[PDB]
């Protein structure tokens, strides 16, 4: 399987939570992380 | 009444389907049963056996097989094979100008055979008139009557394509004894005969006869002195090519690669395949395949009184045979001057769309066999001008022998060349060349090379 | 044995049919008008 | 398209000239023959080629130019029991019919007559003319071939001309009549059509469809076909490449040149392949007497079998794969010192290898 | 479900830009990157390229190791996607570009960069000059012309006018831009 | 040109042969003569067919 | 009966689709029959089956063909067979393939019964007209000379905008029969036959001139004249 569903879940949770609380970038999330989150959402 | 076993259904099919004369090998029971079956003494035969045989044919999935559960199939003129006529006519060719047939018209091969269509015409046209009546203008000749190129009847040989056209001479001549089969055009004619149990008045007989499910291929027993044999199964052409290459490399000057011309007619039972293996059809495909490079020394010479045959007796099963070189051995009839095939080596690649053209990269040479076909090419390369790399030379490179001008502007020439092993061919070259002798017109070349050259040169706009 | 007498006669006619048409489109002896 | 059964159509190349002998009075319901004859022609000039004196069976003869009567539906034309109606080479729907059966004679077979119930087709032995496309020719007013009849039956180099405002159907009929005259010529005649290439191609297409209709009606096949302009250009290029003077070599013979290859090598000549492709834009298959197999553009095929064997007949995976293809292509590139223009394709196989 | 066609189009445009195979310049966004990666994941055809790029999420300062079969498959996939030709050098260029993008943080202004980290030892222009010149001098002239000769100028003024008409609707601005950026990107690739 | 316009094949042939055996025919004079002849023949081939059609025109 | 089948529907588009399929396949023309009594009672299905063997000379028939007729014979079907579509009931229809035979009896139509032409998607039938249609892509208004339209599930109201005035610096020349509809508005009626030999007239508006003498509209048949009156005189 190409997708490491566990790591993808971790990144998706990180960004979604981050965004679940605020409304900004908070520049230690990197485009990758977005990509990570979106891929996780697709797979799940 | 006589009966027959399913184990003898193979003999029944062998005798009734092909034009076979080597009947001495039929066991006694099938011999008598088939004798009565063919002479149409059906009153002495078990009809249940006929139904079993028909079911056997259906089970083996004979192509075009059409019929019902009526003994009239064997007892009367009946459509036994069905297929649709679809001719992509090429009017520029002087085909055998037979009666036209509308594309999509159904066509039925019936078991009836006649030694004179003109005589049968009376009765058959009487039936045709029964079917249609009226005053329909029809195209009628001594060999049948056709309605609007869509219905009617005609007489031909036992084997026609109905999708291609007729051209060129016959590699086989069985018309010497072969009566014309009856063919019916139109569901109307087919259904009429099926329902009416049509049968011409009796004078089987000299005038005509019935050959139920009789394809009529020129079958015969091999009578080969088998030194050795083996079998293989595959659908990968590279495997067959590898076998051929091994045989040629070892000691074989040339191999007889045969393919049976009926392996696509049905899912033949393995028992039937074994029975057929003893026989061969004069019209099956053969190729005399040799090796491009011929070893000069005789150290590679093998047995001088033995031959290697590779028979594709089925769709996926092949049999390699080593037999004693003997004149009496019978073989499929090829063209009187059948060109030989040459195996393709890794040194070059066959040009796409050409049966006799190849290119050697390391040599940067395009070659066209004079009279020989290529064989075994699992790969092909599209032609491209870059292949004809222009040769640079401060003084024009001199050439000898036969030279022809392809493009004076592009310094393209065709040079006659014979491979040291005496393989005639031509080399297509481009560069600064000059001819020792007078350049020669391409029209001097044979149609084979000329066709290849047209394909290679004229862009396919 | 019903030969294609029609086809045979048709070819025989076609042989001289062009000459017959030439006769039709020939010149006339006199102008009655 | 529908036709009334009251019309009977006879198709014959001979009808390029009117068949006076074949005309006969028709009878009414009362079985009384009608002594009045009305002949319909496609153009006024045609009248001059109808000899009223050649109708002894009739007492009065009139000739008119058939014209589309927009006020009458051809599905049910008006009837005129007072006269016997004959149409010669009609180009527009018949809106009028005579007593008994309305007779029609035509060298053309358009859709209008195609559905006509009673269809009598006269058969002829083919005799082809020579296409001589080239810029000592004898001009011929195609609209009036019978005027040039003598020249058409004598000379052998004709320049076919048309009036500027001539109609398409008139052109088609004129060409058909001229080709019939050539069909009766003992010596094939060369001709040049002074028309644009596209117009000539359309005319040839329509003539081909007419011949197809005649065949479907039971006409005898004729090898006297015609070649589209693209096919002619290709043939000319081939002849030039082979160094064959165009005026010296005829297309028919040029093609026949490869019949020596057709069977013995069991291959379809590339010229025939290209001609078939041109016609398709406007597959091949053949065999020999008693032959067990058919030569096709696809290769060898068992007789009566489809043009392609079942998909799973042969496995090509061994070499028909990216790895093998790339390996072979790279080897070729390296050995030949190439960088472009190289393309390798796996070889597929039909029924037979 | 997803608009695989739109995803593919965005992926193709982004890959072209990041491989310097198109002088065309346009805006790009995280939406585009996501389009690309989702398309690659969904496509069975491009799984290898998806894996390659996904590996960039790590340290990404590494040389992926592939079999010859793997490399051929990847190159075939890329070449089929962009319909061209290509090279494993372009593969590495895309890998480096996408790694830089993935590691980059969300920002408001598009980060203008130059090519970097493609194909270990840093070489100066002077060293390249020396080495390449030595090798060239070693090389021998494949072909040559003689002294003098004559430039083959055209003569057909009508032909010149026809060409002028044929080229009139071409904007010199666009042609200049395209040519200059082509040369610049090829130089960038050579340097990297 | 005149012996072409006026259908004087004898004069045309005489001129052609004389030019064949006059001056450096092969070098460039032959090509110039062929060019002129081809141009004249092209014009005549453009005109004559239409002229004949006009003659027989109704 | 070569063959037969039955269908049930109250959607005219379904019948039109069946007719279109039959015409496109190989049918030169279809005999669409409707029984002239299907509205007299809730006939028992058994009675309907009994009646199916019979027909009334006065029932309705339409000889329906296709507007565009393929030139080549490649589309030709059987030459001795006909296709009949019988609306034997209110909602049940039977398609029949029968041998073309004179003895076959049929409902009596008008001696010169005009044929029907199926409507294609290329144009739309003008509302209130049985023989007039408009092709947008061509911007053409056409009136069949003697033929009815058929199958039109949609119609378009006439409007002057349809007769877009053709611009031309020199008047566009016209040939054949030409008639003046409105000299002030440069409106003309031109006799035109569709290449498949379908007579009709084209209503045009623009800068046109006639090669020959213009002709009075009275020369036209009452059919076209009625259609023209409907199309031209405003329904104040």
Residue numbers in the entry:
A (entry chain D): 112 to 155
B (entry chain F): 7 to 209, 218 to 475
C (entry chain I): 462 to 494
D (entry chain L): 1 to 135, 162 to 308, 320 to 390
E (entry chain C): 113 to 196, 200 to 234, 238 to 310
F (entry chain H): 117 to 174
G (entry chain X): 240 to 475
Q: What does the published report state?
A:
The most well-studied baculovirus is Autographa californica multiple nucleopolyhedrovirus (AcMNPV). Baculoviruses have their large circular dsDNA genome packaged into an enveloped rod-shaped nucleocapsid. The BV nucleocapsid structure consists of three parts, a central helical sheath containing the viral genome, an apical cap and a basal structure attached to both extremities of the helical sheath. Herein, we report high-resolution cryo-electron microscopy (cryo-EM) structures of the BV nucleocapsid combined with de novo modeling and Alphafold predictions.
The entire basal structure was determined to 5.2 Å resolution (applying a C7 symmetry), delineating two different symmetrical rings: an outer one with C14 symmetry surrounding an inner one with C7 symmetry. 3D refinements focused on these individual rings with their respective symmetries applied, resulted in higher resolution structures, 4.1 Å for C14 and 3.4 Å for C7 rings. In the apical cap, anchor-2 connects to the C2 symmetric part of the portal leading to a C14 to C2 mismatch while in the basal structure, it connects to the C7 plug producing a C14 to C7 symmetry mismatch. A major difference between the anchor-2 complexes in the apical and basal structures is the presence of Ac98 in the basal anchor-2, which interacts exclusively with Ac144 from the lowermost Ac101/Ac144 module.
